[PDB]
Amino acid sequence: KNKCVNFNFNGLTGTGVLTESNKKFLPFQQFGRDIADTTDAVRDPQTL
Amino acid sequence: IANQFNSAIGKIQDSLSSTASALGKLQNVVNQNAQALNTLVKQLSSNF
């Protein structure tokens, strides 16, 4: 954490910092997007 | 003359505080630049 790196979460490849999420989410949601169609949140395959 | 002048500026203070339709020329400047930048970032989702 606290460093912008290249992540590979089962194909979801990007570059940016990884901070904790503080919003509501669903147990059947894997990622979140904004109006500009960019990935905003990433679900962890192993941990919750 | 001084009574009609001081009562004329008071009629601008209530017209500018009741409705916001008097600044329609300045609202179209901000809304056109916000619509041009929103359409530019939405074209990255296309395939071409």
From Swiss-Prot, chain A:
Q: Which domain of life is it from?
A: Viruses
User: What outcome is documented for mutating T13K in this protein?
Assistant: In strain: Omicron/BA.1
Assembly description: Binds to host ACE2. RBD also interacts with the N-linked glycan on 'Asn-90' of ACE2. Cleavage of S generates a polybasic C-terminal sequence on S1 that binds to host Neuropilin-1 (NRP1) and Neuropilin-2 (NRP2) receptors. Interacts with host integrin alpha-5/beta-1 (ITGA5:ITGB1) and with ACE2 in complex with integrin alpha-5/beta-1 (ITGA5:ITGB1). May interact via cytoplasmic c-terminus with M protein. May interact (via N-terminus) with host bilirubin and biliverdin, thereby preventing antibody binding to the SARS-CoV-2 spike NTD via an allosteric mechanism.
Q: What does this protein do?
A: Attaches the virion to the cell membrane by interacting with host receptor, initiating the infection. The major receptor is host ACE2. When S2/S2' has been cleaved, binding to the receptor triggers direct fusion at the cell membrane. When S2/S2' has not been cleaved, binding to the receptor results in internalization of the virus by endocytosis using host TFRC and GRM2 and leading to fusion of the virion membrane with the host endosomal membrane. Alternatively, may use NRP1/NRP2 and integrin as entry receptors.
State what protein this is by name: Spike protein S1
Its source organism is Severe acute respiratory syndrome coronavirus 2 (2019-nCoV)
Part of the full-length chain shown:
535 to 582 of 1273
Swiss-Prot record, chain B:
User: What is the name listed in the Swiss-Prot or TrEMBL entry for this protein?
Assistant: Spike protein S2'
Query: What exactly does this protein do?
Result: Subunit of the fusion protein that is processed upon entry into the host cell. Mediates fusion of the virion and cellular membranes by functioning as a class I viral fusion protein. Contains a viral fusion peptide that is unmasked after S2 cleavage. This cleavage can occur at the cell membrane by host TMPRSS2 or during endocytosis by host CSTL. In either case, this triggers an extensive and irreversible conformational change that leads to fusion of the viral envelope with the cellular cytoplasmic membrane, releasing viral genomic RNA into the host cell cytoplasm.
Report residue spans for region: Heptad repeat 1.
1-48
| Top-rank lineage group of the source organism | Viruses
- Organism whose genome encodes this protein: Severe acute respiratory syndrome coronavirus 2 (2019-nCoV)
